[PDB]
Write an enzyme that holds these catalytic residues in place. Structure first.
Site, PDB file in Angstrom:
ATOM      1  N   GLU A 266      38.364  30.322  46.759  1.00 52.85           N
ATOM      2  CA  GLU A 266      38.809  31.595  47.324  1.00 52.85           C
ATOM      3  C   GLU A 266      38.135  31.993  48.658  1.00 52.85           C
ATOM      4  O   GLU A 266      38.635  32.818  49.410  1.00 52.85           O
ATOM      5  CB  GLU A 266      38.538  32.771  46.352  1.00 52.85           C
ATOM      6  CG  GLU A 266      39.328  32.681  45.062  1.00 52.85           C
ATOM      7  CD  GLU A 266      40.826  32.793  45.229  1.00 52.85           C
ATOM      8  OE1 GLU A 266      41.612  32.643  44.348  1.00 52.85           O
ATOM      9  OE2 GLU A 266      41.194  33.177  46.366  1.00 52.85           O
TER      10      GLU A 266
ATOM     11  N   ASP B 266      46.274  37.205  52.181  1.00 48.40           N
ATOM     12  CA  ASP B 266      46.104  35.986  51.449  1.00 48.40           C
ATOM     13  C   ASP B 266      47.211  34.977  51.807  1.00 48.40           C
ATOM     14  O   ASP B 266      48.012  35.237  52.689  1.00 48.40           O
ATOM     15  CB  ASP B 266      45.976  36.322  49.945  1.00 48.40           C
ATOM     16  CG  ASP B 266      47.244  36.598  49.193  1.00 48.40           C
ATOM     17  OD1 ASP B 266      47.283  36.670  47.985  1.00 48.40           O
ATOM     18  OD2 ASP B 266      48.318  36.542  49.902  1.00 48.40           O
TER      19      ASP B 266
END
Ligand SMILES: [Cl-]
Ligand SMILES: [Cl-]
Length: 162
Positions: free
Chosen positions: A11, A20
């Site tokens: 991540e 994202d």
């Protein structure tokens, strides 16, 4: 290696609001803020989550606190899920970590619909499940990460992460 390090690799860490891979507002270590197009909205969600007027920037420590809460919630989601729990309980530790990674990324719901893979996993038919999991949008969109998770599930070792 453990779930925390594993996910901090997949991540990353960002202290300013960012989008994202799906284009959604996120912060910290993969903490989704909102699926809405509004940054004001994202900013509002961040402030509620942190408990202060952030202005869209958090500290490392705050990022880690969200992350801990998010990992915790992913576990608890799995244990509360009637389709997932027995799969998870049937596995060793490394493979459970692979499963938490998935639920972290895609939500409990998203993972509970891999019916076929879940069954194979529970049967310990590793190569097969591995093949089945790759036949997914998840794998086509984020192939590098999906392979890492998929190898871990496959082998039950951390080699994909060394
Ligand atoms: Cl929150
Ligand atoms: Cl990826």
């Amino acid at each position: 290696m453990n779930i925390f390090e594993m996910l901090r690799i997949d991540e990353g860490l960002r202290l300013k609001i960012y989008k994202d891979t799906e284009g959604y507002y996120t912060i910290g270590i993969g903490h989704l803020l909102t699926k809405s197009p509004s940054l004001n909205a994202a900013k509002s969600e961040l402030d509620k989550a942190i408990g202060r007027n952030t202005n869209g920037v958090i500290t490392k420590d705050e990022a880690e606190k969200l992350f801990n809460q998010d990992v915790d919630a992913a576990v608890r989601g799995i244990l509360r899920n009637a389709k997932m729990k027995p799969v998870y309980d049937s596995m060793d530790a490394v493979r459970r970590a692979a499963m938490i990674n998935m639920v972290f990324q895609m939500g409990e719901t998203g993972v509970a619909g891999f019916t076929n893979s879940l069954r194979m996993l529970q049967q310990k038919r590793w190569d097969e499940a591995a093949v089945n999991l790759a036949k997914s949008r998840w794998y086509n969109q984020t192939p590098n990460r999906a392979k890492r998770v998929i190898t871990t599930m496959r082998t039950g070792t951390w080699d994909a992460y060394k």
